[PDB]
Design an enzyme around this catalytic site. Structure first.
Site: not given
Length: 104
Positions: A38, A58
């Site tokens: 992720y 991110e």
């Protein structure tokens, strides 16, 4: 307080830092979450004005559930580099292709 109120959610800028070290601790640990890495690096292109570094990253930020791990965050997503600093809170849904954009 809460200077990142996106989707009508006054998120605490101080609470975003904790979740900021969440996607970071993983990016530096080399480990991963869920099963698709992720925490990644964002290149940026839209047209922001951050003032941290080039190699952004991110990771989803929450204020009720917990570290992204068993669900679907998307939308809100504070960015960072490699010191849990803070590039800015961008959204992944308020723009075509949920592009990122400072929460406004």
């Amino acid at each position: 307080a809460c200077d990142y109120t996106c989707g009508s959610n006054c998120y605490s800028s101080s609470d975003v830092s904790t979740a900021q070290a969440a996607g970071y601790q993983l990016h530096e640990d080399g480990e991963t979450v869920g099963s698709n890495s992720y925490p990644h690096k964002y290149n940026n292109y839209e047209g922001f004005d951050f003032s941290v570094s080039s190699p952004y990253y991110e990771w989803p930020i929450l204020s009720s559930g917990d570290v992204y791990s068993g669900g679907s965050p998307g939308a809100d997503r504070v960015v960072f580099n490699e010191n849990n600093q803070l590039a800015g809170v961008i959204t992944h849904t308020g723009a075509s292709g949920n592009n990122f954009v400072e929460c406004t």
